[PDB]
Amino acid sequence: MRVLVTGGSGYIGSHTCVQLLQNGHDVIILDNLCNSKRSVLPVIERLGGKHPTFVEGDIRNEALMTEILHDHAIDTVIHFAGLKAVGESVQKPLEYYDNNVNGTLRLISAMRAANVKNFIFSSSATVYGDNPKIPYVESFPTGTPQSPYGKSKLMVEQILTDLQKAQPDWSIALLRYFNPVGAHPSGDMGEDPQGIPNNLMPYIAQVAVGRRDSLAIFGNDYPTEDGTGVRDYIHVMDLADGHVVAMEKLANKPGVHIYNLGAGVGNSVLDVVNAFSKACGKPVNYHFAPRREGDLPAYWADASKADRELNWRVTRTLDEMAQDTWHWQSRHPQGYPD
Amino acid sequence: MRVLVTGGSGYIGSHTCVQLLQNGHDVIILDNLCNSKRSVLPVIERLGGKHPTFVEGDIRNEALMTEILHDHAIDTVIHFAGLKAVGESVQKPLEYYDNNVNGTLRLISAMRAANVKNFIFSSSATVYGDNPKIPYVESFPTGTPQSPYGKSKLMVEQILTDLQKAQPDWSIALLRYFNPVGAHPSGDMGEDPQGIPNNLMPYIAQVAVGRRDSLAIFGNDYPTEDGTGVRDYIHVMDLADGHVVAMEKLANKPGVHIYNLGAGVGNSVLDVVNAFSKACGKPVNYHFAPRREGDLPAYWADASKADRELNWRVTRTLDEMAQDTWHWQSRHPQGYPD
Ligand SMILES: NC(=O)c1ccc[n+]([C@@H]2O[C@H](COP(=O)([O-])OP(=O)(O)OC[C@H]3O[C@@H](n4cnc5c(N)ncnc54)[C@H](O)[C@@H]3O)[C@@H](O)[C@H]2O)c1
Numbered sequence A, B: 001m002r003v004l005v006t007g008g009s010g011y012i013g014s015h016t017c018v019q020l021l022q023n024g025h026d027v028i029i030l031d032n033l034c035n036s037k038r039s040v041l042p043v044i045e046r047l048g049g050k051h052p053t054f055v056e057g058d059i060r061n062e063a064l065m066t067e068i069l070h071d072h073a074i075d076t077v078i079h080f081a082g083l084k085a086v087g088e089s090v091q092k093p094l095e096y097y098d099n100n101v102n103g104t105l106r107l108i109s110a111m112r113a114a115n116v117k118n119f120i121f122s123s124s125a126t127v128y129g130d131n132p133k134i135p136y137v138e139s140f141p142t143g144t145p146q147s148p149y150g151k152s153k154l155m156v157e158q159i160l161t162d163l164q165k166a167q168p169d170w171s172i173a174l175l176r177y178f179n180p181v182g183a184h185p186s187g188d189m190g191e192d193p194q195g196i197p198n199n200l201m202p203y204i205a206q207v208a209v210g211r212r213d214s215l216a217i218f219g220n221d222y223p224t225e226d227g228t229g230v231r232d233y234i235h236v237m238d239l240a241d242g243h244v245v246a247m248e249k250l251a252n253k254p255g256v257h258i259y260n261l262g263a264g265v266g267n268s269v270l271d272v273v274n275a276f277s278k279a280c281g282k283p284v285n286y287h288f289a290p291r292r293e294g295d296l297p298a299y300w301a302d303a304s305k306a307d308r309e310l311n312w313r314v315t316r317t318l319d320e321m322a323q324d325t326w327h328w329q330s331r332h333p334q335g336y337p338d
């Protein structure tokens, strides 16, 4: 099929585009380059073994969206474009609501004008909010997200939901995930944070590489097996796969299809650090700090539904996530070239 | 002070502008005329005894908002502009999210660029969602609104809340109200629905006037004194007053100030009908229907906080709401002139 991939040049999107091309689909990437570089493009092509069209632009530009949609006879849209730095979200709320909330609204509005009715949304497991019932299941009602980032994701979910109700021919997937990590096995694509990495893995990778001194472990007091925070980590390649399957299997199947994408088990901070020490061949330096603002002791996704309904499940291990990361970090220390 | 009143030519806004002018404030009205007519303008001036500047335009146009803000040296903004038809909201969700969510975001963004930090938001008591704890108190956490309309209001509240947190110098009021009714005592301004009136009072007024056959009373089965739905009705003049006070008393007082605006008591459907039969001098025709989609047996606002903190409370009665309505309906059967 003909797919428009917003945010396609970013971390998850790039990986997804390669898998898409490999499946022989026609790929149109829409990205504003606010958090990615044109240099990834040729890598996508190479790895994908096919040429994806690239359009520089913003989801907030409804006019352009409609043009693109029409110009390329788009059948489906996988939407990864947006802002995702939780801490930044607290400091710059408006920017998050605009890019995420308004950004998606402008996009779906254009789809409406262009008669495109298949959509796959990059959601987030932060929508579950404060849930003492873990792991999280899709049948669980959502809660109230802690940050402007989380709130914007639920807001979008709600909007798409009402939309589908008003325009029942629409097929919409809400893909909820936690912590994506790893990189393409080639070691030639991966996560390329500009500045202080947000997530654990990359941060740790930076500590490993020499860039950082020590990892601060926020809380060693939790009601967990080792006292540190337990989270769900999913390999980026598996995530990308889940995206392709969802897109192929749900196209033209009316409704709001909610699926948690994850390994179905949790891992502590120490578990992640040990995995990494192992992958990079040297002890990762860390120290303990006291509980970070807004964090919970432990949570993960129940991914039975996707297994059952989409026949999808993870295949990569925590160790591979680490190795893959180390590999990319190692082959391309300066990330993507400017 | 210099105040920008978005949606100022509509029902509540017009009333509010008159009270504003009377208080000697400088009023700039911003309206897109999607639900009001230029003809109300001269009435505003007359009743207000002062000239308000009028600008035709849309809140979604950030550029214009900023211009306006700067051009007039705005000190505070009272925001009534938006869409509010609940049933229409279910049928046309996008339009509601755009006008309400995006609409406010564009407006506050402009304020940001123009260095305007005092805001009064026309909120809604639908934000309380499904609350079996009545009456509703501001200390109660919000729930999940039933319609796209309700959801958009809570979304806006959430956005303004995070904003204030990131820009602590801002003063923001969230004014939660239920069912505004009545009209200016002059009988020369009032609610002018185009088409099938949404709310009870006006609908009933139309039945009275001859336009409608009978009022359908959705449910006579409720756990209420008379079996019909109990709601909170607030006279439009009192609402307008609450708006002025909030604006004058909260300007430059940092924080998110939440206040329920209401009478503090509930009235059933039959109560409203009887009140109206009485005001128009003739039995209002009605019949019973079974429970409308999404409605609850009874709810109202606890307005102690406003009384205490703002020294504000209603002064008009249900009977006046009815009389005033009948009066306007009677002096101007064709509403505002085109
Ligand atoms: N990265 C994560 O850890 C994570 C976790 C949960 C959910 N998600 C969701 O996945 C999506 C992308 O995540 P990611 O990890 O690939 O991050 P990313 O920054 O690498 O990729 C997003 C891409 O979108 C682009 N973009 C941002 N705003 C845009 C706009 N207004 N118009 C056009 N392009 C725009 C950026 O330039 C970047 O290339 C977002 O929906 C995010 O909320 C990601």
Ligand SMILES: NC(=O)c1ccc[n+]([C@@H]2O[C@H](COP(=O)([O-])OP(=O)(O)OC[C@H]3O[C@@H](n4cnc5c(N)ncnc54)[C@H](O)[C@@H]3O)[C@@H](O)[C@H]2O)c1
Pocket (backbone or CB within 6 Å): B006, B007, B008, B009, B010, B011, B012, B013, B030, B031, B032, B033, B034, B035, B036, B057, B058, B059, B060, B079, B080, B081, B082, B083, B084, B099, B103, B122, B123, B124, B125, B177, B178, B179, B180, B199
């Ligand atoms: N009317 C009610 O029953 C009610 C109940 C609860 C909350 N509220 C809130 O009060 C506000 C106004 O209520 P109202 O009763 O006066 O209705 P209204 O339609 O009479 O007034 C709103 C006005 O806003 C204008 N407008 C709408 N969208 C606009 C946009 N995008 N840009 C510029 N102007 C725009 C319309 O032309 C109209 O003049 C809204 O915030 C509504 O949610 C109203």
Ligand SMILES: O=c1ccn([C@@H]2O[C@H](COP(=O)(O)OP(=O)(O)O)[C@@H](O)[C@H]2O)c(=O)[nH]1
Pocket (backbone or CB within 6 Å): A178, A179, A198, A199, A200, A201, A203, A215, A216, A217, A218, A229, A230, A231, A269, A292, A295
């Ligand atoms: O410098 C860091 C970054 C992350 N974490 C922990 O690593 C886990 C994964 O968090 P991250 O921010 O990567 O994602 P989250 O699970 O909050 O999305 C959480 O328990 C964080 O508490 C940590 O201790 N130090």
Ligand SMILES: O=c1ccn([C@@H]2O[C@H](COP(=O)(O)OP(=O)(O)O)[C@@H](O)[C@H]2O)c(=O)[nH]1
Pocket (backbone or CB within 6 Å): B178, B179, B198, B199, B200, B201, B203, B215, B216, B217, B218, B229, B230, B231, B269, B292, B295
């Ligand atoms: O044609 C109508 C319109 C309204 N109502 C009732 O009048 C009350 C006020 O409802 P409205 O739509 O005016 O506002 P709500 O309280 O739902 O905002 C509610 O119990 C409605 O059930 C009714 O029975 N028939």
Ligand code: NA
Pocket (backbone or CB within 6 Å): A165, A166, B090, B091
């Ligand atoms: Na419909």
Ligand code: NA
Pocket (backbone or CB within 6 Å): A334, A335, A336, A337
């Ligand atoms: Na670099």
Ligand code: NA
Pocket (backbone or CB within 6 Å): A090, A091, B165, B166
């Ligand atoms: Na801050």
Ligand code: NA
Pocket (backbone or CB within 6 Å): B334, B335, B336, B337
């Ligand atoms: Na008329």
